[PDB]
Design a protein around this ligand. Structure first.
Ligand SMILES: [K+]
Ligand SMILES: [K+]
Ligand SMILES: [Mg+2]
Ligand SMILES: [Mg+2]
Length: 222
RNA sequence: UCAGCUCGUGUUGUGAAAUGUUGGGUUAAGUCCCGCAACGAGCGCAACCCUUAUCCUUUGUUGCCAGCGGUCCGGCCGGGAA
């Protein structure tokens, strides 16, 4: 709803100087040298994206949430876990999708290390070796924790800030994976299949998007 | 004995190529961490080997002599295993 979005601060945009001219249709206007996104445009476009996401969920298609920004990192994890969907909330590895075959090997290493930790193999290691393994496991977990159970290419991508996650979008476009993304005034919307014009900086705005997308997929799954 | 030299897949470039391997620190070291369109891997680095420095255990002659006994004063002898 528009009332919730204005409360969330979805309408707030970046400063006019950093705008991308392709975003002009979505922008309502500028106040205090800050672009204001037209919520009237956002609400129908958000609804259309949610409807498609619901359909993909009904088909049992895997959904990947990307939110590398630290502010939204935890929220992206929680929303994906809530809907039992895969996520990436730390730096996106270039070639995660395009070079999935190579990236899979790291996933296999992560799960092996996890089992070894549970096994107590680390105890057999001479402390230092265990520490190295532990450090490796932590790094692998942060990067590949969300996609460890994905076991293939995601059927759809939901992205926060298209500009920040340009690599991920470019990979998705290459592999013909549909992209759903929140595009702020500064960002370019050409890559995204389904564009949602909203603030991506604000956690409150981010949570609103994530809550809705998690809910719609969950209904699709049911 | 210098810390270099490369590859697969991905990505960028019409292309030769590039990236990875650069960057911020750090190291004897492409050593390590962090960052990062790269993600991984191999040969090198290091370690694994030999010798040297300390200690313990076992063994005690052809090596040893602290404590005993005796001396031809030489562990020399009976001994002892320190
Ligand atoms: K050129
Ligand atoms: K290459
Ligand atoms: Mg090395
Ligand atoms: Mg060596």
């Amino acid at each position: 709803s528009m009332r919730d979005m204005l409360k969330a601060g979805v309408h707030f945009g970046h400063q006019t100087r950093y705008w991308n001219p392709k975003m002009k249709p979505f922008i309502f206007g500028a106040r205090n040298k800050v672009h204001i996104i037209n919520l009237e445009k956002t609400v129908p476009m958000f609804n259309e994206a949610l409807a498609e996401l619901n359909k993909i969920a009904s088909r049992k298609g895997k959904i990947l949430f990307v939110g590398t920004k630290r502010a939204a990192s935890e929220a992206v994890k929680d929303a994906a876990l809530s809907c039992d969907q895969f996520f990436v909330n730390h730096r996106w590895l270039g070639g995660m999708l395009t070079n999935w075959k190579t990236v899979r090997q790291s996933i296999k290493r992560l799960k092996d290390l996890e089992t070894q930790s549970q096994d107590g193999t680390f105890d057999k290691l001479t402390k230092k070796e265990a520490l190295m393994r532990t450090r490796e496991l932590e790094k692998l977990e942060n990067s590949l924790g969300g996609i460890k159970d994905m076991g293939g290419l995601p059927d759809a991508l939901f992205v926060i800030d298209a500009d920040h996650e340009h690599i991920a979008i470019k990979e998705a476009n290459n592999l013909g994976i549909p992209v759903f993304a929140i595009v702020d005034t500064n960002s370019d919307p050409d890559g995204v299949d389904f564009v949602i014009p909203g603030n991506d900086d604000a956690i409150r705005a981010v949570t609103l998007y994530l809550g809705a997308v998690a809910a719609t997929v969950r209904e699709g799954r049911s």
